[PDB]
Structure 1
């Protein structure tokens, strides 16, 4: 039935006079797929939506929200497109030169070089990494700290009742905000940014976002056993739990 739904979109996109209904329905369809984490499904739909839809449509409470929801959804997708690239890279680290104990004088020199070339690649694989870390992070904070009212949260409050959508928007927050936090923690930990890891407890507990309400009690503790792990590595470095110099 996947196709039935992703195909009803091209029918609504065809007629430009129904772009407001095409987007709204595109949202709904992408709300079902997100709850299943079908990101190639959600995105295959996301491209069918002409890149210039938003511009033309220009506002009923149903169109202000659907424009916001669409960008929220793009902010979410882009937060998985850049992580899978980053993650793919983290798993392609240059491998150490192989050792040939009891080497011939030939094998000694081939190895002096293979050992010197590797000490060039590992520097760039931290180079490319840093730039894929700086980018995946930004996206994770665009979703977690979504501007003007939080992610998947309507700004317009005068639409007509849509319990399906509304409760789909509360759920999407409870499936994906705990899951984006845990990823960002995994990104920060993987790159050794431990001080910042611990600063996820400010972001989450914050009264500005009230992200902690989107967490189950279990997920919290889990995030608290994740942070205590970053803390350790900060002690091993000689700093206090939170990364500040011990005077």
Structure 2
């Protein structure tokens, strides 16, 4: 249940989480600004939550795929947020790679190295 919920939150409609369908060019742009701010401040939080979930459930393949999911342009995550959040995401990815390599499995891709 929680995996399906987090997957739906990540791959919600209109690309990333909370994406404005119509621009507020004729009303109040403050709503769109607040939506963008909340998205850029909450997407790393959901990423860390899913990283911890996959760490506890042994899903290093999904942990590695989360990097590509974040880098995808559908989530509108072009590294324009907090450097502290970037460092925390990098530390989580390094921990995932270390936990995957501890079981004699290289983190290159999803299986053994080429």
TM-score band, normalised by the shorter chain? Answer: 0.7 to 0.9
- 8 Å CA contact 1:149, 1:155 repeated in 2: no
Structure 1 residue corresponding to 2:73, chosen from 203, 207, 220: 207
Shift of 1:164: 2.6
Q: What is the rounded CA distance, in whole Å, between the counterparts of 2:84 and 2:50 in structure 1?
A: 18
Q: Match of 2:42? A: 176
Query: What are the Cα deviations for residues 144-193 of structure 1, in whole angstroms up to 9, with x where unaligned?
Result: 22212432211123762313311210121022111111000010011111
- 8 Å CA contact 2:17, 2:75 repeated in 1: no
For the pair shown, the structure with the greater C-alpha radius of gyration is: 1
Q: Does 1:219 align with 2:85?
A: yes
- 8 Å CA contact 1:144, 1:150 repeated in 2: yes
- Between 1:188-197 and 1:213-222, the stretch displaced more is 213-222
User: Cα distance 1:141–1:214, how it changes in 2: closer, same or farther (>3 A)?
Assistant: farther
TM-score by length of 1: 0.42
Matches within 5 A, 1:1-247: 135-157=1-23, 160-213=26-79, 215-242=81-108, 243-246=110-113
User: Cα distance 1:189–1:212, how it changes in 2: closer, same or farther (>3 A)?
Assistant: farther
Q: What is the rounded CA distance, in whole Å, between the counterparts of 1:149 and 1:195 in structure 2?
A: 22
Q: How many residues align?
A: 113
Flag as ranges the 4+ runs of structure 1 deviating above 4 A.
none
- 8 Å CA contact 1:173, 1:214 repeated in 2: no
User: Cα distance 1:165–1:187, how it changes in 2: closer, same or farther (>3 A)?
Assistant: same
TM-score by length of 2: 0.84
Gaps of 5+ in 1: 1-134
Larger helix fraction of residues: 1
Gaps of 5+ in 2: none
- 8 Å CA contact 2:15, 2:74 repeated in 1: no
Query: What are the Cα deviations for residues 7-46 of structure 1, in whole angstroms up to 9, with x where unaligned?
Result: xxxxxxxxxxxxxxxxxxxxxxxxxxxxxxxxxxxxxxxx
